Amino acid sequence: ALWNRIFSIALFVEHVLLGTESHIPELSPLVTTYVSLLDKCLEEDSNLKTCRPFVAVMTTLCDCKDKASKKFSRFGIQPCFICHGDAQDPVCLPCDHVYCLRCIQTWLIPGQMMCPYCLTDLPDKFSPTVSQDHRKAIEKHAQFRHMCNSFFVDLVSTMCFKDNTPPEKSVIDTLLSLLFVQKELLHREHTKSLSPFDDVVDQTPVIRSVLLKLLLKYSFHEVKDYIQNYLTQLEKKAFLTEDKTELYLLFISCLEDSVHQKTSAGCRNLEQVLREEGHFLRTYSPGLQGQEPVRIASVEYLQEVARVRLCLDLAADFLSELQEGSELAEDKRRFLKHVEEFCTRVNNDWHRVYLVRKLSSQRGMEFVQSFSKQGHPCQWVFPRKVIAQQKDHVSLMDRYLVHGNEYKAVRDATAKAVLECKTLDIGNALMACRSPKPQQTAYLLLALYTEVAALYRSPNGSLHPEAKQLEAVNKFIKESKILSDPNIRCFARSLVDNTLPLLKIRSANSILKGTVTEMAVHVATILLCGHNQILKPLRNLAFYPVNMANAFLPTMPEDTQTGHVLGSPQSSGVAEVSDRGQSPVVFILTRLLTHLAMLVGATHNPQALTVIIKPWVQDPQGFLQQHIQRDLEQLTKMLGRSADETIHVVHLILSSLLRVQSHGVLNFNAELSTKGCRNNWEKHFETLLLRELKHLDKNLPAINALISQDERISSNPVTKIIYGDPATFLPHLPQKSIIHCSKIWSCRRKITVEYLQHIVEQKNGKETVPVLWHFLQKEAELRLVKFLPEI
């Protein structure tokens, strides 16, 4: 009792009183009074999980607020009567009412020369605006209202929802009531952001989820009706005639996050979870005719949907490691048998759509297309027509469409000029192309890679182009002066004659080696075609690896160990915390491009990369390729993306190192002979990486549009049930329901710690959340102070 009282008063002091002393010191004798008034209203019973003290604290905070407003600006700072919010560019009438300037110019200009509220005329014009008295009064009132809101929401989050038992019905109904505001005059039925106050009100109904995430920390069996009341209120006043997909999607997301919390913080193993969910799946009657006239989707139905999504997520996680390797622990096997029997019995193909999307979001499209074979024992995950509508010539995603619509022209001309044997169309696509000679040469080299070396990859198209199709290609390569550079057309011939020793990269995964091969060819093309001072060191890791022994490679440890001082990538260590001044994404991107240039170098001569890499004696290609694998896994963890989008990020960053021929990048040696040249490299390259990562949130959907609507991937139905297209070309799925659209059965991201570290780094966390920033920087090392008293 006494500590709940002391802690509530401490929340008030911390959020209101110290903010008043720091920012607006005209209200400190008011808030020091209301400390004592909170103490006296909590000394009877400081049990904020009940109704009476919670209403008492809320009333004390409300009259603290309005006495502060009357202390500011002469008996009643009020919101604008027209826009129902804070007055922007304030204008005060002689009837002591403050309005917005835009509201009083959009209202008073017809023949209604009066006041909207107190019906009092204004003679001449609303000419003076007050930028000193009323503007500062409204701003300081906004600050004090924000302090009181921070106190109230922190008090509700900490005291009302403290322990494992839920609070009473009256306090929860009070909270759900104060999500909404009353009607004043017609617009009505507004919303507000969990405040005891009424003046800060948005004009369009937004739907927060703070009380869902606070109520769902209890068991769902005892908070059904509260969420159903909140949903019924939202459906009867706010979104009564709308597209109610996103509201349902917010509720499904909150419910599945609550189940993630109660299985993570709960103490039960995988075996009990698999038994409980397997019992759930083999008794799930569909009942979709029960709640869908159009609009009724209760919270029991949404909870069954969220629980089905979690069963399918466990199925996706099991299938992503079943086909990684060996046997699958005999409980995961039985659970996948239950998921298969579930998808067979229940005739909803949206579960299989979500399962395909989730396997592709974890692994990629090629891994999922490997399940669509003629007897692969994971073929049940597809819906019914996707197996029959595929051909025997599934093609890979062209990830060089990052360049886009000038690469598209050259790859189409190259494809037709290897299809027939007429290589004038490549010259027509290049001469009608902007983005000058470095970019055009890179487009031509990547097109030659894509078409000709992807013909050598397949067992159908290999040993085919040697029959009089490579002769016109070789004649164009010898003839064309857009690649008249003897280090470039030697590379072009090595792509076409299949003599480039990157293409024999020799890995055992056969999905990853395609990714690493495409990235290494992209790196080698950028380092040949790009003319930039920030490509000269990596160039000597790739094309002249003997110059670059006794040289400090980027993202290496420093106290000093020149060369490549990293051990085996198959270690059990901490996750290689970032450099002297770098965020972990920029760190892993710099390390990944260094390793890709080193792989391109070690494919030419492995001896110079043996004398660069310090410990072993055996081989550099598999070593560097395992490092590239680990870097891609860490980059997938950090960026909250799918696998394919992370690879698009890498290819986009590689593309951006070519168009950036502005030179502000001097003052380091091209050999990187010192620490200082390496660190200046780090700085300029971090500048390019941050320019490209500030801007990728809008480039990623355009790149996914170019790669999804490529007319060699687009007709594939796996692509049409993953990328940007609903699965409603399939007829055998439920009709236009509110609950069975493509948006509800889409995949989302599991929220990791590295993703939150990435958000802290995006949102300037050194200066905004510095304890959290320092915590996330050293988190994997701080897991192990737990073992200090044992050692």
| Closest approach of Zn ion to the CB of residue 136, in Å | 18
Q: Is 359 in the site for Zn ion (CB under 5 A)?
A: no
Residue 720 tokens, joined: 């049409």
Contact pick of 100, 528, 703, 721 for Zn ion (by CB under 5 A): 100
Whole-angstrom CA distances from 628 to 358, 516, 546, 618 are 24, 8, 22, 18
Q: Is 138 in the site for Zn ion (CB under 5 A)?
A: no
Residues 6+ apart with CB under 8 A from 343: 351, 352, 355, 380, 381
Question: Looking at beta carbons only, is 102 or 262 nearer to Zn ion?
Answer: 102
Question: Looking at beta carbons only, is 82 or 396 nearer to Zn ion?
Answer: 82
| DSSP string over 84-95 | SSPPSSEEE-TT
Instruction: Choose one: 82-90, 590-598, 620-628, 718-726; the region binding Zn ion (CB under 5 A).
Output: 82-90
Question: Looking at beta carbons only, is 107 or 755 nearer to Zn ion?
Answer: 107
What is the H or E stretch that residue 62 is in? helix 51-73
Q: How far is CA 735 from the centre of its chain?
A: 31
Residue 523: helix, strand or coil by DSSP?
A: helix
**Cα–Cα distance measured from residue 174 to residue 179, given in angstroms and rounded to the nearest whole number:** 9
Instruction: Choose one: 80-88, 186-194, 259-267, 297-305; the region binding Zn ion (CB under 5 A).
Output: 80-88
| Closest approach of Zn ion to the CB of residue 121, in Å | 10
Contact pick of 97, 332, 411, 595 for Zn ion (by CB under 5 A): 97
Q: Is 527 in the site for Zn ion (CB under 5 A)?
A: no
Instruction: Choose one: 42-50, 73-81, 337-345, 621-629; the region binding Zn ion (CB under 5 A).
Output: 73-81
Whole-angstrom CA distances from 210 to 7, 156, 189, 216, 584 are 22, 10, 19, 10, 31
Residues 6+ apart with CB under 8 A from 603: 501, 502, 505, 520, 621
Instruction: Choose one: 92-100, 223-231, 708-716, 743-751; the region binding Zn ion (CB under 5 A).
Output: 92-100
| DSSP string over 128-175 | ---TTTHHHHHHHHHHHHHHHHHHHHHHIIIIIT-SSS---HHHHHHH
Q: What is the DSSP letter of 403?
A: T
Instruction: Choose one: 114-122, 228-236, 262-270, 274-282; the region binding Zn ion (CB under 5 A).
Output: 114-122
Question: Looking at beta carbons only, is 82 or 415 nearer to Zn ion?
Answer: 82
| Closest approach of Zn ion to the CB of residue 200, in Å | 13
Binding residues for Zn(2+): 80, 83, 95, 97, 100, 103, 115, 118
| Closest approach of Zn ion to the CB of residue 90, in Å | 9
Contact pick of 10, 118, 206, 270 for Zn ion (by CB under 5 A): 118
| 460-519 positions binding Zn ion, by CB under 5 A | none
Q: Is 541 in the site for Zn ion (CB under 5 A)?
A: no
Contact pick of 37, 51, 55, 82 for Zn ion (by CB under 5 A): 82
Question: Looking at beta carbons only, is 85 or 734 nearer to Zn ion?
Answer: 85
| 212-251 positions binding Zn ion, by CB under 5 A | none
Contact pick of 16, 31, 91, 115 for Zn ion (by CB under 5 A): 115
| Closest approach of Zn ion to the CB of residue 106, in Å | 9
Nearest to 228 by CA among 300, 156, 170, 161: 300
**Cα–Cα distance measured from residue 27 to residue 331, given in angstroms and rounded to the nearest whole number:** 64
| Closest approach of Zn ion to the CB of residue 103, in Å | 3
Q: What number of chain residues touch Zn ion (CB under 5 A)?
A: 10
| Closest approach of Zn ion to the CB of residue 98, in Å | 9
Binding residues: 80, 83, 95, 97, 100, 103, 115, 118
Question: Looking at beta carbons only, is 68 or 100 nearer to Zn ion?
Answer: 100
Instruction: Choose one: 90-98, 296-304, 345-353, 671-679; the region binding Zn ion (CB under 5 A).
Output: 90-98
Question: Looking at beta carbons only, is 118 or 577 nearer to Zn ion?
Answer: 118
| Cα radius of gyration (the chain) | 32
Question: Looking at beta carbons only, is 94 or 290 nearer to Zn ion?
Answer: 94
Angle value at C-alpha 490, between 487 and 495, nearest 5 degrees: 125
Residue listed under structure tokens 């696998």 = 643
Q: At what angle do helices 643-656 and 621-638 cross, to 10 degrees?
A: 110
Question: Looking at beta carbons only, is 113 or 240 nearer to Zn ion?
Answer: 113
Site string for Zn ion, 584-613 (x = CB under 5 A): ------------------------------
Q: Is 104 in the site for Zn ion (CB under 5 A)?
A: no
Residue 594 tokens, joined: 């260094």
| Closest approach of Zn ion to the CB of residue 85, in Å | 6
Sign of CA dihedral 166, 167, 170, 171: negative
Q: What are phi and psi of 62, to 5 degrees?
A: -65, -45
| Closest approach of Zn ion to the CB of residue 222, in Å | 43
| Closest approach of Zn ion to the CB of residue 126, in Å | 12
Q: Is 103 in the site for Zn ion (CB under 5 A)?
A: yes
Q: Is 522 in the site for Zn ion (CB under 5 A)?
A: no
Nearest to 135 by CA among 74, 73, 193, 179: 73
| Closest approach of Zn ion to the CB of residue 81, in Å | 7
Three-state secondary structure of 302-367: HHHHHHHHHHHHHHHHHHHHHCCCCCCCCCHHHHHHHHHHHHHHCCCCHHHHHHHHHHHHHCCHHH
| Closest approach of Zn ion to the CB of residue 88, in Å | 7
**Cα–Cα distance measured from residue 727 to residue 353, given in angstroms and rounded to the nearest whole number:** 7
Nearest to 665 by CA among 646, 649, 647, 680: 680
| Closest approach of Zn ion to the CB of residue 76, in Å | 12
What's the one-letter identity of residue 747?
A: C
| Closest approach of Zn ion to the CB of residue 208, in Å | 23
**Cα–Cα distance measured from residue 542 to residue 520, given in angstroms and rounded to the nearest whole number:** 10
Question: Looking at beta carbons only, is 100 or 589 nearer to Zn ion?
Answer: 100
Instruction: Choose one: 107-115, 220-228, 600-608, 687-695; the region binding Zn ion (CB under 5 A).
Output: 107-115
For the chain, the distance separating the N- and C-terminal CA atoms, rounded to the nearest angstrom, is 40
Instruction: Choose one: 11-19, 77-85, 375-383, 679-687; the region binding Zn ion (CB under 5 A).
Output: 77-85
Contact pick of 31, 80, 247, 448 for Zn ion (by CB under 5 A): 80
Residue 546: helix, strand or coil by DSSP?
A: coil
Question: Looking at beta carbons only, is 126 or 773 nearer to Zn ion?
Answer: 126
Contact pick of 1, 6, 10, 95 for Zn ion (by CB under 5 A): 95
Site string for Zn ion, 18-37 (x = CB under 5 A): --------------------
Per CB under 5 A, residues contacting Zn ion are 80, 82-83, 95, 97, 100, 103, 115, 117-118
